[PDB]
Design a protein around this ligand. Structure first.
Ligand SMILES: CCCCCC/C=C/CCCCCCCC(=O)O
Length: 276
């Protein structure tokens, strides 16, 4: 018995036929890419006001520290499956310093797109399916994966004239890291502005661009924290609520249902395959 994957995490959700997932102000804690196994689905981004049709050759990229508002509805007469690959921070910082040379046009890209669509060529279909096939690959050295992912993200960015992988100087990254370092603390806007030794304009623009008040942002971060806790194997709802910084199981359940459109136990089952 050896270790689990330190660069990625792979998560699992069963989309029953014609069902609709609705995400309202969900905080993306790490760079994510997801795709469906078969059939097709209607993906409605309520941020950029755009509806797409995604197939098994599509991948959706979700930018770290974004606040997503979108829906996913199966269009096929089949029970389809959504696989979510999360790329952890160490791997992302490896990617940031991997591409040889200066990309002269990247200095002119914009950061305004948080949800990017890429219709895969056969090579990328292969590589991604092999990454998520098992819990190890080992046929795939992490250096091969660094090269692959740096190239893939560059391709997507060029497709959209936008920055996917930001630097770590980003103000939203600082806010998120600070909140997550003490998730149970009763943070207030002034505390974060003071500890981040940054004025309230620089920081409040991060809230306005994502369309969230401060309390909404704290709640979204805590919901994503609770989901990460459920990833780690913690399954007691009371512990999940308290460790994520919520005052009560009832308030945590209310916020979780408002954000993910399912109760914490329902998400638990969709992730676990194990009902009570
Ligand atoms: C929170 C990101 C959801 C984007 C994935 C598309 C839909 C997936 C099915 C519902 C899963 C919601 C929790 C996903 C969290 C994760 O696996 O990283």
């Amino acid at each position: 018995m050896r270790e689990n994957n330190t660069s990625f995490l792979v998560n699992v959700y069963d989309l029953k036929k014609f069902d609709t997932y609705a995400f309202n102000k969900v905080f993306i804690d790490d760079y994510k890419i997801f795709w469906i196994n078969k059939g097709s689905a209607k993906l409605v981004d309520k941020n950029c006001l755009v509806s797409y049709t995604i197939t098994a050759s599509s991948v959706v990229l979700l930018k770290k520290n974004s606040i997503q508002r979108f829906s996913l509805m199966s269009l096929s007469d089949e029970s389809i499956s959504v696989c979510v690959l999360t790329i952890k921070n160490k791997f992302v910082n490896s990617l940031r310093h991997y591409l040889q040379g200066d990309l002269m046009i990247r200095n002119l890209y914009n950061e305004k797109k948080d949800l990017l669509l890429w219709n895969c060529e056969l090579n990328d279909i292969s590589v991604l399916g092999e990454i998520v096939s098992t819990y190890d690959q080992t046929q795939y050295s992490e250096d091969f994966l660094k090269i692959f992912f740096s190239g893939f993200f560059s391709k997507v960015e060029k497709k959209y004239n936008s920055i996917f992988i930001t630097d770590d100087l980003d103000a939203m990254e600082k806010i998120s890291c600070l909140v997550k370092s003490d998730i149970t603390r009763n943070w207030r806007w002034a505390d974060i502005c003071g500890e981040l030794r940054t004025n309230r304009m620089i920081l409040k623009k991060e809230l306005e661009s994502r369309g969230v008040k401060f309390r909404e942002l704290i709640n979204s971060i805590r919901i994503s924290y609770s989901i990460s806790l459920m990833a780690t194997g913690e399954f007691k709802i009371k512990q999940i609520a308290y460790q994520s910084g919520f005052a009560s199981v009832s308030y945590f359940s209310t916020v979780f249902k408002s954000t993910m459109n399912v109760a914490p136990s329902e998400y638990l089952f969709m992730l676990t395959g194990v009902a009570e």
